[PDB]
Design a protein around this nucleic acid. Structure first.
Ligand code: MG
Ligand code: MG
Ligand code: MG
Ligand code: MG
Ligand code: MG
Ligand code: MG
Ligand code: MG
Ligand code: MG
Ligand code: MG
Ligand code: MG
Ligand code: MG
Ligand code: MG
Ligand code: MG
Ligand code: MG
Ligand code: MG
Lengths: 168, 324, 118, 138, 52, 177
RNA sequence: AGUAUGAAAAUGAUUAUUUUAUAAGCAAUCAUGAAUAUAUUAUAUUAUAUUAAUGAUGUACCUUUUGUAUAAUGGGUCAGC
RNA sequence: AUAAUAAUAAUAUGGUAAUAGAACAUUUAAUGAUAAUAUAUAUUAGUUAUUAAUUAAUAUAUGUAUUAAUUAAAUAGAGAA
């Protein structure tokens, strides 16, 4: 309904942010960050359903919480407009949730330690196979096209300074 | 009194100055003077003429002003006189550039292929290059609004000194271009300005010193580096070379191994020379034999085409491109 | 001195010396002298005098300094400037005093405008 | 068959016609502000006029602002040097102005040893080759 | 209190010391005056429509 | 030999076999004032230089023709032929008439699998290239061949496709000069 | 141990760029390829920035001593004092 | 007969303990224009022979510097207890 052409100028960051995503967040999980990492590294770039399945059959305690989070993120994505079979976990990390209560451990022979009690949160960003993954495939293709070939007897720069004199 | 009335009369005065380009006002303009001194323009070229050269055509304000919602607002420039713009000048400058540059290229490389020559000409006087040159010179665009200028209460001299066309305010704000015609592009306006200056120079000097314009062009345009060897891209050069040899009084070209090392390695070196009789035409190194052969043919073709005769020689008119 | 092949050749290089510092140049080359020129201002032209070698692809005239009559070699002074500012620190091995040796040497950008056999 | 590769020329400022690198200088000062005294004195005292007479290809803007006194140059390449001349005397300001006018606009940069000449041109003699050398290796 | 005439070399000039506040006030008055002009014209047009 | 200049290597004061890269030695080496002949230690592939262009490509009124600088260092008798066609070794033949050509064309359309280019060449004592120039095959056959080629390409791995791309880029680069 | 605010650092996880699975030491500096990013004068054969190809040089800091890479003193890191 | 800046010729410019001279950052007091087109703080990239300040962009605050400058002073500068 218009004869006006346009050209859009976005940055890399702007491109990244505007692709359809969904941002899951856990509640105050009772665990170490290290323990969370030990699981979460497995769920790197998986499809959300696959990740959920892995969490269900994992032996770890954080696993259930991670599964629940993934389920919530899927539900959010559905509400927005996205599909659950389209969603993959783009990023998933953990962090300290703060207010870890220290508590002295009394040892033998008038010695002591301090026992902290770590609480964490897992956040994750689900992105779409339909868009983000396609975009990065396209970028990879462009990079491949750009890539200058290996030339056998090719023009390499004569590195070093000339010194105001012909050496040949 | 009313501030609107004060603004309106200022605008009217500005419009009148644009229509005239009165000489005293143009002289007062510091930017014009500095431009004149920078380029070492002739004293016969008046400051009014220089101001005019910076004035692009802008008779009527376009329909796209009606909506800034569609991504355009033209609020900087003021309407110009029909018979006092850079338009006629610009055309003349373009013609001069197309003549002289091309002639210089032909003098340099009398056998240069037609497509290659055209590319070289473009390189020397393309719109982007011309715009860059204008920027380098210091031809700045009138980006500031008329209202803003009035508020600052700046003279009309400064306006005259700047480049004046329908430059779209909010051109790429929020990363949104509108893709308008050539009559609203900055690069094009800058190109026109540099061509208009050349035309003005020609107009003033033609009767006294006819070649003054052409030496100015040589100084500014033809002084720029262009390796003509980087312009070429052959397809089946051996066949073309053979055709060339047939056309001239030369024996059939055959490629022969001069030197060889590292056969049966990742990166050998094969030197082959395309001989016509005992004379070698092209020398070709390569990783493969085929590659070396190809390179020798391309070298021969380069030597044929990019042959540059001396000025002392009588004119070399080539016998056309080698039609394979 | 039969200087005919040099005169004929389309490509041609020079090895002129400013204060015995050699600089190998063609026309268009942009020399960067490592000092502040006092004599010439920006825009001034320098006629090179102590030209050691004038060379084609296969020949070279050599003189110390080649006859000024035989050639031309005009440089233009295209901007006095400086190197980037640097501050190396000077200190001994059990001494808290660390003297900062600030440095920002001068440069003079020449451009070889003309180079030809006269 | 032969085809062109679209390519653009490189401007060497010096070779044909020298365009002077410094195009515009802005003298900025403050009426209040004791740091702008030497700048103010310079503006007053017939030196600026002489300067403008000497260099009519540079335009000399004179601005008033609340902050420290400023000398911003503007060059052909599009770069902009800005020197703050706070608490400098007249003569120091003038020296700074001279320095600015001297500059080709390009960014400051570390040079390696003997990194003297900067050519666009292909070598007049070729690049060395072991097959084509005068003395063959062994 | 320098001026462009003071220096007597035409490449030198002094930009006009107009305070930002004064400029803003001027802008306000002009745009306000335009608005007033427009509103009166619209009212007149409405009155004419009502009449016939 | 027009010019009788003394000839010089690009001389260092140091040992050239051990210190060829040492610019300092070159800088040190002074030689007596005059004209010299320093033959270039380079191939003349990319050079548009006037001392590199051959005499046949120079114009008739060029002074440079007479001067001895396009040196014929190599000899065509000594060098052996590289990727040379059989026409170039033993001369081109223009023997086949119109009728023979028409017969060849008829054959090729009829059955390009049986009567292939090489077979035609063998029959008529002529080149496969010439056969191709003379006669088109049935477009169906060409389409089949294209489809086969596409299938082969698909059968590749990722690596092979990349290598083929690189090869193509190299080929393109060869013809630049 | 006020209330707001908080891209202050140490510290953790994750992503991106880049280097890294035949190479040996204060982990820097200088030389020098390559890859990537940004660049409303890259006109380019462009400029800056980031990055342990490769090469060269390089015995933490302080204190106390005739004298310390010392296997002599002292410091887990950063913030405030 | 001075001061500032710039020339030329000459001599000098490693430094622990130590002596002498000159600056800057920070905080308070006296005097004090200006202003959201401004100021402050932070990040990034430029600039000035650069512990400092300045330019531009970006961010957050504030209808605003005890601001520039000169003085007076100091809980006035921290990898070393
Ligand atoms: Mg908190
Ligand atoms: Mg116990
Ligand atoms: Mg613990
Ligand atoms: Mg130390
Ligand atoms: Mg000691
Ligand atoms: Mg040795
Ligand atoms: Mg390895
Ligand atoms: Mg190790
Ligand atoms: Mg140890
Ligand atoms: Mg120790
Ligand atoms: Mg310890
Ligand atoms: Mg000392
Ligand atoms: Mg203290
Ligand atoms: Mg501290
Ligand atoms: Mg310290």
């Amino acid at each position: 309904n218009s004869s006006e052409r346009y050209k859009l100028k976005l940055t890399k960051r702007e491109i990244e942010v505007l692709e359809p995503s969904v941002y899951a967040q856990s509640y105050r999980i009772k665990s170490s960050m290290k323990k969370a990492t030990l699981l979460l590294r497995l769920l790197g770039g998986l499809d959300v359903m696959k990740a959920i399945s892995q969490c269900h059959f994992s032996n770890k305690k954080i696993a259930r919480e991670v599964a629940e989070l993934l389920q919530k993120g899927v539900k959010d994505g559905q509400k927005l407009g996205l599909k659950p079979e389209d969603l993959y976990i783009s990023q998933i990390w953990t962090g300290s949730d703060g207010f870890w209560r220290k508590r002295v451990e009394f040892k033998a022979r008038t010695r002591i330690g301090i026992i902290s009690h770590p609480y964490i949160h897992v956040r994750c960003i689900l992105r779409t196979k339909s868009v983000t993954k396609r975009r990065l495939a396209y970028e990879a293709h462009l990079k491949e096209q750009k890539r200058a070939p290996w030339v056998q007897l090719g023009d390499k720069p004569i590195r070093g300074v000339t010194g105001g004199v012909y050496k040949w | 009194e009313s501030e609107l009335a004060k603004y309106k009369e200022y605008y009217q005065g500005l419009k009148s100055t644009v229509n005239e380009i009165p000489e005293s006002v143009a002289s007062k303009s510091p930017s014009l003077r500095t431009l004149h001194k920078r380029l070492q323009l002739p004293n016969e070229l008046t400051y009014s003429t220089l101001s005019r050269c910076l004035t692009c055509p802008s008779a009527k304000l376009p329909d796209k002003i009606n909506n800034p919602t569609k991504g355009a607002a033209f609020v900087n420039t003021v309407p110009t006189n029909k018979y006092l713009d850079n338009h006629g000048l610009n055309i003349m400058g373009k013609n001069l550039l197309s003549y002289h540059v091309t002639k210089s290229i032909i003098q340099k490389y009398p056998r240069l292929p037609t497509v290659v020559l055209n590319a070289a000409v473009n390189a020397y006087i393309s719109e982007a290059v011309l715009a860059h040159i204008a920027k380098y010179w210091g031809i700045e665009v009138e980006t500031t609004s008329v209202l803003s200028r009035y508020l600052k209460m700046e003279p009309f001299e400064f306006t005259l000194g700047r480049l004046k066309f329908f430059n779209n305010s909010l051109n790429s704000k929020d990363g949104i271009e509108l893709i308008t015609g050539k009559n609203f592009s900055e690069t094009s306006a800058l190109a026109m300005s540099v061509r208009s200056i050349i035309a003005a120079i020609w107009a003033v000097t033609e009767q006294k010193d006819s070649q003054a314009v052409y030496r100015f062009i040589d100084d500014h345009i033809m002084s720029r580096k262009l390796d003509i060897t980087k312009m070429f891209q052959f397809e089946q050069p051996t066949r073309e070379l053979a055709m060339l040899c047939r056309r001239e009084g030369l024996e059939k070209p055959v490629s022969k191994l001069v030197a060889e090392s590292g056969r049966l390695s990742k990166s050998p070196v094969f030197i082959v020379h395309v001989f016509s009789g005992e004379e070698t035409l092209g020398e070709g190194y390569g990783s493969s034999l085929k590659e070396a052969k190809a390179r020798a043919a391309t070298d021969a073709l380069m030597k044929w085409y990019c042959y540059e005769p001396l000025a002392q020689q009588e004119p070399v008119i080539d016998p056309g491109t080698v039609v394979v | 001195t039969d200087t005919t092949p040099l005169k004929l050749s389309n490509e041609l290089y020079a090895i002129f010396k400013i204060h015995n510092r050699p600089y190998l140049v063609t026309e268009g080359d942009r020399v960067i002298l490592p000092f502040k020129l006092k004599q010439a201002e920006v825009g001034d032209i320098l006629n090179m005098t102590d030209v050691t070698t004038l060379g084609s692809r296969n020949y070279k005239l050599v003189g110390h300094p080649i006859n000024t009559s035989l050639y031309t070699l005009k440089a233009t002074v295209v901007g006095k400037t400086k190197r980037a500012f640097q501050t190396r620190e000077v200190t001994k091995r059990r001494n808290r005093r660390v003297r900062h040796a600030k440095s920002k040497g001068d440069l003079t950008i020449l451009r070889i405008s003309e180079l030809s056999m006269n | 068959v032969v085809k062109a590769i679209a390519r653009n020329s490189i401007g060497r400022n010096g070779v044909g016609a020298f365009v002077f690198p410094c195009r515009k200088i802005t003298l900025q000062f403050c009426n209040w502000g004791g740091s702008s005294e030497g700048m103010r004195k310079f503006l007053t005292s017939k030196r600026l006029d002489k300067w403008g007479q000497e260099f009519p290809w540079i335009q000399f803007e004179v601005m008033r602002k609340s902050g420290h006194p400023l000398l911003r140059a503007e060059y052909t390449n599009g770069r902009e040097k800005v020197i703050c001349v706070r608490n400098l005397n007249i003569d120091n300001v003038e020296n700074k102005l001279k320095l600015l006018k001297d500059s080709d606009g390009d960014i400051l940069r570390r040079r390696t040893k003997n990194d003297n000449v900067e050519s666009l041109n292909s070598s007049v003699r070729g690049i060395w080759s072991p097959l084509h050398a005068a003395k063959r290796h062994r | 209190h320098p001026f462009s005439d003071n220096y007597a070399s035409p490449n030198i000039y002094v930009v006009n010391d107009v305070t930002s506040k004064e400029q803003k006030s001027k802008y306000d008055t002009i745009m306000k005056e335009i608005q007033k002009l427009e509103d009166d014209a619209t009212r007149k047009a409405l009155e004419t429509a009502r009449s016939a | 030999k027009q010019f009788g200049f003394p000839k010089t290597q690009v001389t260092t004061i140091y040992n050239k076999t051990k210190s060829a890269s040492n610019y300092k030695g070159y800088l040190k080496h002074r030689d007596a004032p005059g004209m010299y002949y320093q033959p270039s230690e380079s191939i003349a592939t990319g050079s548009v230089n006037s001392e590199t262009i051959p005499r046949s490509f120079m114009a008739a009124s060029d002074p440079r023709r007479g001067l001895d600088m396009p040196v014929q260092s190599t000899k065509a008798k000594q060098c052996p032929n590289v990727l040379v066609g059989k026409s170039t070794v033993n001369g081109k033949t223009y023997h086949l008439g119109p009728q023979e050509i028409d017969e060849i064309r008829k054959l090729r359309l009829d059955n390009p699998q049986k009567y292939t280019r090489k077979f035609l060449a063998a029959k008529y004592g002529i080149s496969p290239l010439f056969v191709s120039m003379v006669s088109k095959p049935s477009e169906q056959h060409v389409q089949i061949m294209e489809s086969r080629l596409q299938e082969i390409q698909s059968r590749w791995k990722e690596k092979r496709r990349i290598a083929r791309e690189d090869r193509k880029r190299r080929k393109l680069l060869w013809y630049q000069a």
